[PDB]
Amino acid sequence: ICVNENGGCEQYCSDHTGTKRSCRCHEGYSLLADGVSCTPTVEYPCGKIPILEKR
Amino acid sequence: IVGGKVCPKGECPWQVLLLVNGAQLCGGTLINTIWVVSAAHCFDKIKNWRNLIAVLGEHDLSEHDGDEQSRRVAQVIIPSTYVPGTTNHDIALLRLHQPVVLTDHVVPLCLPERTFSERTLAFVRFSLVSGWGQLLDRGATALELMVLNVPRLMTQDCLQQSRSPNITEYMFCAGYSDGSKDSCKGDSGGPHATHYRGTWYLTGIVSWGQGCATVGHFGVYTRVSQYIEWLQKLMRSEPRPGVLLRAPFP
Ligand SMILES: C[C@@H]1CC(=O)Nc2ccc(S(=O)(=O)C3CC3)c(c2)CN(C)C(=O)[C@H](Nc2ccc3c(N)ncc(F)c3c2)c2ccc(OCC(F)F)c1c2
Numbered sequence: 305i306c307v308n309e310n311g312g313c314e315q316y317c318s319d320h321t322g323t324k325r326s327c328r329c330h331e332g333y334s335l336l337a338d339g340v341s342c343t344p345t346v347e348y349p350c351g352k353i354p355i356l357e358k359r
Numbered sequence: 360i361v362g363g364k365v366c367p368k369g370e371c372p373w374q375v376l377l378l379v380n381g382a383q384l385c386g387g388t389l390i391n392t393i394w395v396v397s398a399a400h401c402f403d404k405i406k407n408w409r410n411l412i413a414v415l416g417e418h419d420l421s422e423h424d425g426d427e428q429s430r431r432v433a434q435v436i437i438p439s440t441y442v443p444g445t446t447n448h449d450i451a452l453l454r455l456h457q458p459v460v461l462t463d464h465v466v467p468l469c470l471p472e473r474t475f476s477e478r479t480l481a482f483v484r485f486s487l488v489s490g491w492g493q494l495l496d497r498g499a500t501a502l503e504l505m506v507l508n509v510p511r512l513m514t515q516d517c518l519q520q521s522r523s524p525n526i527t528e529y530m531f532c533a534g535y536s537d538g539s540k541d542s543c544k545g546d547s548g549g550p551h552a553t554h555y556r557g558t559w560y561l562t563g564i565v566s567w568g569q570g571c572a573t574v575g576h577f578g579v580y581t582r583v584s585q586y587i588e589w590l591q592k593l594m595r596s597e598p599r600p601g602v603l604l605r606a607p608f609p
Pocket residue numbers: 384385400401402403404444445446449523524541542543544545547565566567568569570571572577578579
């Protein structure tokens with residue numbers, strides 16, 4: 305599932321025993337209830353540009 | 360950087376400037392508050408290991424605006440498989456003596472997981488390369504940070520499109536063969552950053568080429584996805600005395 309369109313995950317994807325898939329996030333982010341989206345939990349998450357985010 | 364543009368101040372917040380005795384040495388990428396990824400070849404000629412400085416929040420070399428943060432480099436970690444003066448395994452992991460403070464101008468780039476980088480990031484066509492390197496082949500280096508968008512090629516495609524060493528599984532080609540746009544020697548160690556669903560990730564390191572922006576040749580970048588496990592294990596390790604450390608690879 306992870307090989308195809310990143311398994312629908314915004315960030316990381318883990319394949320499980322069967323047709324199961326778990327999305328995960330980098331440190332400084334948490335997974336939303338949709339099970340695919342990553343939201344920042346810190347002021348300066350990695351790979352985001354503050355002057356563009358604050359606009 | 361040849362044929363790019365000035366990176367607007369604060370839009371490349373993970374870019375590092377490496378200095379030796381106050382002189383420009385190479386670029387680098389901040390991946391958290393204490394670790395920097397650069398190129399192993401940046402350190403081939405270093406004798407003054409205690410005079411290595413990393414600068415974060417840098418933009419214009421002619422002026423100090425208060426956003427710059429300087430740190431001494433406590434450790435330079437290079438894979439055992441890297442041979443000085445050659446191209447393969449061109450990566451270095453740098454430990455800063457004290458962490459940088461994250462601000463609107465100092466932010467780490469995400470180091471991705473190997474699977475995500477190989478299965479997804481490797482297929483994003485364009486990525487950004489940046490540095491204070493040469494603005495022209497045999498020309499002056501830049502006073503303001505420059506950035507360039509470059510497309511990635513499959514290695515079979517790079518070899519057929521090129522007019523010289525091998526491109527190994529630890530490298531990838533990116534750029535143009537018409538001599539208009541490329542990263543240069545002074546950009547060595549800097550990031551090749553990839554955007555995916557609203558977030559930027561580290562995919563390459565400015566490594567080598569056959570003259571800057573020369574017709575028939577592409578830029579060659581270290582394939583960072585091959586080093587994720589090696590980097591993660593070292594970031595979990597305790598510091599060792601002495602600046603230079605050679606660590607087994609794989
Ligand atoms: C690392 C590989 C082998 C080697 O010569 N090692 C090597 C060791 C130390 C130094 S140093 O000055 O102490 C250090 C930077 C501070 C250097 C080089 C300086 N230097 C010439 C360099 O750093 C240059 N780097 C780049 C980087 C990107 C380039 C690009 N994207 N397009 C065109 C270029 F010309 C691009 C050129 C480069 C050109 C060819 C090349 O190897 C050529 C191969 F045929 F052997 C290599 C590197």
